[PDB]
Design a protein around this ligand. Structure first.
Ligand SMILES: CC(=O)N1CCC[C@H]1C(=O)N[C@@H]1COC(=O)c2ccccc2C[S@](=O)C[C@H](C(=O)N(C)C)NC1=O
Ligand SMILES: [Cl-]
Length: 285
């Protein structure tokens, strides 16, 4: 029984919520709140532990970008602080290779990072790796063939359709085929050896379009669009299906959870979050 965890988010301000959805019985679990509210964070799992990486705490009285790394133990229902990153990273992308967390791009105030750093849970240490070829905030990160892909985002001036690839063994980045659509704040994940980029914002509108990268043909192909246009959505893969959680559609903060079936190329609404929010960190354990 694996659960879909949603951490933080934004609605009126940055949120502390930690909730877990059970796709089998359709139930929601209210877990221990994050010690610090955060939106624009990313979640990941290493060794059955959930990690909440970066983000920003938006409050009516002030905002603070986060360099924090926090660890949640499902067995104890406890958050424990870990070593912080070298810099705050709001609107971050995260990816796991060999139980090591890569924190990719994001912003700190006026600064749009191209820097990337890697966390080692065994040492509780962050180390900078080679920076990306492009500054990317609202970046989608996917791990495919033990390579770390950084997909779309925003560079401080322009929203990107470009994508690049990190080779951990060689410690280097290379540009790959650009997507068909410019996407900042999309849901990026890997399903059946493909990278999916669902939703996002193109500089004008929130998107419902979904495209997938096939490594063999090095091409991006459009698949069935989602029912809702959404940017700042949470995304995950559970039992061979894609789940998109919340986001912003240009008018409202969505509580909608859609599920993608690759066999039928269809999306369906599976549940609703307890409240609408955007900028959540999502992971499965
Ligand atoms: C104008 C604006 O963004 N404001 C004004 C001050 C607070 C901030 C706000 O409200 N941010 C939240 C949280 O967003 C995120 O965590 C996030 C995470 C990843 C990528 C991108 C985003 C942005 S999201 O794609 C754009 C969407 C929006 O345009 N409005 C609601 C008007 N904003 C949001 O949901
Ligand atoms: Cl924000």
């Amino acid at each position: 029984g694996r659960l879909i965890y949603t951490a933080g988010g934004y609605f009126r301000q940055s949120l502390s919520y930690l909730e877990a959805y059970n796709p089998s019985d359709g139930t929601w679990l209210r877990l221990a709140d994050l010690q610090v509210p955060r939106s624009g964070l990313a979640g990941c799992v290493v060794g059955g532990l959930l990690y909440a990486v970066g983000g920003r705490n938006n409050s009516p009285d002030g905002n603070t970008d986060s360099s924090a790394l926090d660890c949640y133990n499902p067995m104890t229902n406890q958050w424990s602080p870990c070593a912080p990153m070298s810099v705050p990273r709001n609107r971050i992308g995260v990816g796991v290779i060999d139980g090591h967390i890569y924190a990719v791009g994001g912003s700190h105030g006026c600064i749009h990072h191209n820097s990337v750093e890697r966390y080692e849970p065994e040492r509780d240490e962050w180390h900078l790796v080679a920076p990306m070829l492009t500054r990317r905030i609202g970046v989608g990160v996917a791990v495919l063939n033990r390579l770390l892909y950084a997909v779309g985002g925003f560079d401080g001036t322009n929203r990107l359709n470009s994508a690049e690839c990190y080779y951990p063994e060689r410690n280097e980045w290379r540009m790959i085929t650009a997507m068909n659509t410019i996407r900042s704040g999309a849901g990026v994940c890997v399903l059946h050896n493909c990278i999916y980029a669902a939703g996002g914002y193109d500089g004008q509108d929130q998107l419902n379009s979904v495209e997938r990268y096939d490594v063999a043909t090095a091409t991006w192909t459009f698949v069935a669009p989602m029912k809702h246009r959404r940017s700042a959505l949470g995304i995950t893969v559970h039992q061979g299906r894609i789940y998109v959680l919340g986001g912003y559609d240009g008018h409202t903060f969505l509580d909608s959870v859609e599920c993608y079936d690759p066999d039928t190329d269809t999306w369906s609404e599976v549940t609703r979050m307890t409240s609408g929010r955007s900028g959540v960190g999502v992971a499965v354990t």
